[PDB]
Design a protein around this ligand. Structure first.
Ligand code: FAD
Ligand code: FAD
Ligand code: ML1
Ligand code: ML1
Ligand code: ZN
Ligand code: ZN
Lengths: 230, 230
């Protein structure tokens, strides 16, 4: 209600189920009085590739290009490409970052993987040392709102695809927790293409419903046990 | 007769450790008499975004764009973009596909995620019921040759990053095994940037040596147990 939210959205079609989930999030968070910003990656033609065009100043080592080293320096020097710094400003100001996307190969679509690769650079999102619980984005919350082609049953320990929490590991732990985020439970909307119109409406309303009390939620314990068990 | 190998390579710098690993694989497999092809993604400025430009001609439903449906239809109608079909031909002809890349956020760099998203389309790499053990690329071998920033110790069951098999899941099981590939054990070159010059030349040498008997190797048992179990 007195918070800022950044929604990083990755779907090509406004009329899609992902489009609906993104829109209801904007509607509900706005109704609450929150400040809301959406980075619609495909509409922005967001650059996913990590290249030397991401640094505009003199390279530290112009003979052997190392993306991590050069972007870390460029961040400190303020010589990163502006599309990257534009996103960093949104993240810096946000209290909560919601990622809205369809699962592609049990991960994020490449345009969103590119956002992770390029925006969460050393110096901004983490440092060495300064990761996991000491990540630079500590104090901020993050939530993955994903949609799948597979059904919930397929995403179980005994299902063909295994438990859904397994594929969340690189994203929730390896990325968000690594950067210091407290991770809220994922919103997983299963197989909307298969579901009925009513079921679809039900999944949208369940997300809107959850958002009504999102600020009262506790984050998940982002650990190997939560993700894998035993 | 002999064997064909496709190396999908994702690094910006020819002089990099990844570059050396790619070059030694070409050298050794070429020496053995194998047919070798390399898709140098950054040099090709490979497009990572899944968009409507991936279909030439007219869409099956230009009212509501569904990437999966549209690319499935385009594959069947021979209407996919040429960058995608060029890669599919290389995959179709290959007996082994080696992916050479540095680990970015517990996964592949976005440009390689884009190759995965755009090249491995329904109808080409999988279908109903062609998936996992019956995936359409059955008969082919696949192998991940990854370099990391974190030490082998950090990637232990109780290490801060967790076991490496944890992040391998979405790639080995969710992607490669899903498409029918028999997955060979991953080649992990841990923290080459911190290692000594000789430890480095050592890691390169180990990879070249392993490649000497790559065709005698047996595919790992790609299962939830292999990745998380004991
Ligand atoms: C490259 C690629 C890789 C993939 N890999 C995976 C994977 O690893 N695992 C997996 O499980 N899936 C995978 N998928 C499938 C993908 O995750 C699903 O297609 C996606 O999650 C469905 O989301 P959508 O928004 O596109 O659905 P839509 O096609 O939009 O379908 C949802 C339906 O809901 C309707 N709808 C929209 N808004 C509303 C509303 N407000 N109320 C009611 N109905 C509404 C739509 O019109 C539509 O008919 C992959 C897809 C691609 C293209
Ligand atoms: C966006 C991003 C996200 C990342 N996320 C992760 C992550 O999730 N997990 C993680 O662990 N790390 C992560 N990293 C780190 C990354 O995985 C490592 O930086 C990368 O794997 C190192 O490989 P390289 O080829 O770039 O090394 P290089 O720096 O190119 O090479 C290391 C050294 O080897 C030397 N060398 C090259 N060839 C040879 C040879 N033939 N013999 C001897 N010496 C040689 C080089 O000159 C150099 O000094 C991330 C990096 C970035 C930029
Ligand atoms: C990995 O498992 C799945 C499961 C359900 C799915 N539905 C659709 C796709 C992929 C469709 N991509 C293209 C480019 O055509 C898919 C993959
Ligand atoms: C997990 O996320 C990341 C992201 C960008 C990165 N750059 C470099 C490293 C690892 C290098 N650290 C040590 C001391 O082993 C890294 C990790
Ligand atoms: Zn965690
Ligand atoms: Zn498997």
């Amino acid at each position: 209600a007195g918070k800022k939210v950044l929604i990083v959205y990755a779907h090509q079609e406004p009329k899609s189920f992902n489009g609906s989930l993104k829109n209801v999030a904007v509607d509900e968070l706005s109704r609450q009085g929150c400040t809301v910003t959406v980075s619609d990656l495909y509409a922005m033609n967001f650059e996913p590739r990590a290249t030397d065009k991401d640094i505009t100043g003199t390279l530290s080592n112009p003979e052997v290009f190392n993306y991590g080293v050069e972007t870390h320096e460029a961040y400190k020097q303020r010589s990163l490409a502006s599309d990257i710094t534009d996103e960093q400003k949104k993240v810096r100001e946000a209290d909560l970052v919601i990622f809205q996307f369809p699962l592609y190969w049990f991960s994020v679509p490449a345009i969103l993987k590119g956002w992770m690769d390029r925006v969460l650079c050393q110096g901004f999102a983490f440092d060495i040392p300064g990761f996991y619980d000491s990540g630079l984005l500590q104090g901020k919350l993050a939530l993955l709102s994903v949609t799948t082609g597979g059904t919930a049953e397929m995403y179980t320990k005994t299902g063909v695809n295994g438990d859904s929490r397994y594929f969340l590991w690189p994203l929730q732990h390896g990325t968000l927790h690594f950067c210091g985020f407290k991770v809220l439970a994922p919103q997983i909307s299963f197989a909307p293409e298969i579901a009925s119109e009513e079921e679809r409406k039900g999944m949208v309303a369940a997300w809107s419903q959850r958002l009504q009390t999102i600020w009262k939620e506790e984050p998940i314990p982002c650990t190997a046990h939560w993700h894998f068990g035993q």
